[PDB]
Symmetry: C3
Amino acid sequence: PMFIVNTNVPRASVPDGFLSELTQQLAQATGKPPQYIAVHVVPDQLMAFGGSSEPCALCSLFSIGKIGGAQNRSYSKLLCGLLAERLRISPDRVYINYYDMNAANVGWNNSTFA
Amino acid sequence: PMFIVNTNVPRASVPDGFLSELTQQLAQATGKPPQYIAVHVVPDQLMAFGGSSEPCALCSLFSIGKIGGAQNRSYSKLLCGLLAERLRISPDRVYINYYDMNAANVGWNNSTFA
Amino acid sequence: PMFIVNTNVPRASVPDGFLSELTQQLAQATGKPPQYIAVHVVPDQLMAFGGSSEPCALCSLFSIGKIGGAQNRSYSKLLCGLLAERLRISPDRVYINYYDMNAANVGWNNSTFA
């Protein structure tokens, strides 16, 4: 799985340990081993949410399966919880685009996951 | 909706009020309230278009519906127009990826839009 | 085609000529004219792969067609090879999301490719 968070929160406001916490919690949420979880945080971004510049986040979660209505609600509760607790972003200023990737459409290690 | 613009144009060349203009024009174009429009501008990027490092942009527009053949032509005229007028990027050096997101695949406020 | 590479490798470790090499190699691999190939490299990123902050890359390849099982395996060998040779990133620390874009969902030059 691959999780990306783009935010206007400054780099100094991203706590130590955050990439590991994301890795750990996404391994548990997705059921996939942490060795397969990739995380990316992009602070200090020029962005607006609903016409204003209070803390916000625009995010992506890609997974080969483990994507669906109930699962995505669960992911959103987890991820908005983490962004609120750790980056002080209001859950109503977070968007997460979920993608169910076909194994043949994910490259890794000179091949794909097909 | 979520609009992202990645460009090699420098930060100083992004006019004050550009995010607000994108928010307002996208609210009008998509018919969605401005409260639900998110915009993200990423200047100073290491990118090339056709092998050239002249000004260019690589963009994304995500919407839950309001995506289709004719609507995307209209969005492209609008957004290439704004990038030309405000960032001096030639329309033929802009790509915009359009995505028609399923409501169940968009997280927000600890849940999804489903 | 549009190729994006996000990496924790520092900017100084991205060799001169890299965007041109990516453009040229992707033109040959995809069969598309180099005029239509866009490339974007984002170094210095805060990211982890498998919980580790050793060199890694999270990438995207978009194309209108020329995406599929065998083609994507071939792209992955090419792109992992270039990232290993030029950025010293292990192929097993690269993820590439492949996207087969509908021509109607790609804006360019004030319209779409439909």
